[PDB]
Ligand binder design. Structure first.
Ligand SMILES: *[B]([O])([O])[C]([C][C][C][N])[N]C(=O)[C]1[C][C][C]N1C(=O)[C]([C]C1=[C][C]=[C][C]=[C]1)[N]C([C])=O
Lengths: 249, 7, 26
């Protein structure tokens, strides 16, 4: 995150870290959606262009973390994966369209003060909240500038108008994406960066005061660049796919 | 790397 | 379920330092 702040203790109980055995290093961010399911961006695991292609065996999940690099002794719980599910129609070739994947832990985590699942949106919900001007929140242990934080960062960015998004890049933007961030003539700034992908973009329902995952950190051209905006997987749009994998499996 | 070993 | 309700905030009726920013945009 760029232009964010230190997250408060237990502020994002759903925040997960994608971590690799050898070499021990932070792959991406992710979210806890249930006791056995984690939701990240598919490009975190599959990206041929960079020869990136992770299998269940190369990863560990680190849940309930605050410190980026420390092994938080009696707080964090590290999980192994049973199975990974990338969306059959994720377009890694052109525009990371449908940049989403689901992970099945080998054993369900037990919740606590630091570990707690976020809510998936519903039609009514996404319909009320995914409005230009409305603020959401991204968290992550990503790069600070386009070095690294000791602690989880957080920033609140506004949903931008579809057009503006479109006119901000040469990339072909689809219905499965939304952009967020401040426009150049607004003052405030901030964005996600390398090591933030797979992390959640969350809004708090003004109706039931519950937290929902409306998006997944997908892409952007640099970080906190003026006249640029952040790109996220539109989670509601891909919901039936998720359900399906939850059902099936 | 910057990382602390895990159990 | 009990989703999106943080043990340390919502469950205790405690607000985070910047959650209000969000709500004021809605
Ligand atoms: B993530 O942490 O991995 C990161 C988050 C957004 C950075 N603000 N995502 C990326 O780096 C993605 C994955 C590979 C390419 N990418 C980009 O953001 C590209 C733009 C792009 C979009 C669609 C298809 C291919 C490339 N941007 C840059 C600056 O490389």
């Amino acid at each position: 995150i760029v232009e964010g702040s230190d997250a408060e203790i237990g502020m994002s109980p759903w925040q997960v870290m994608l971590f690799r055995k050898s070499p021990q290093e932070l792959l991406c961010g992710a979210s806890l959606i249930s006791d056995r399911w984690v939701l990240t961006a598919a490009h975190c695991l599959l990206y041929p262009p960079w020869d990136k292609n992770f299998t269940e065996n190369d990863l560990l999940v680190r849940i309930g973390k605050h410190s980026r690099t420390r092994y938080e002794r009696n707080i964090e719980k590290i999980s192994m994966l049973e199975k990974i599910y990338i969306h059959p129609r994720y377009n890694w070739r052109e525009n990371l369209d449908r940049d989403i994947a689901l992970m099945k832990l080998k054993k369900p985590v037990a919740f606590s003060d630091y570990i707690h699942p976020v809510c998936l949106p519903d039609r009514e919900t996404a319909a009320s909240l995914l409005q230009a001007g409305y603020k959401g929140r991204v968290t992550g242990w990503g790069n600070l500038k386009e070095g690294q934080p000791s602690v989880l960062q957080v920033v609140n960015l506004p949903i931008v108008e579809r057009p503006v998004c479109k006119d901000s890049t040469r990339i072909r933007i689809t219905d499965n994406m939304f952009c967020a961030g401040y426009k150049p003539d607004e003052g405030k700034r901030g964005d996600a960066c390398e090591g933030d992908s797979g992390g959640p973009f969350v809004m708090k329902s003004p109706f039931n005061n519950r937290w929902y995952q409306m998006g997944i950190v997908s892409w952007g051209e640099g970080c906190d660049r003026d006249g640029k905006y952040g790109f996220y997987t539109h989670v509601f749009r891909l919901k039936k796919w998720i359900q399906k994998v939850i059902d099936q499996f | 790397g910057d990382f602390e070993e895990i159990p | 379920a009990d989703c999106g309700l943080r043990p340390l905030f919502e469950k205790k009726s405690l607000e985070d330092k910047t959650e209000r920013e969000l709500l004021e945009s809605y």
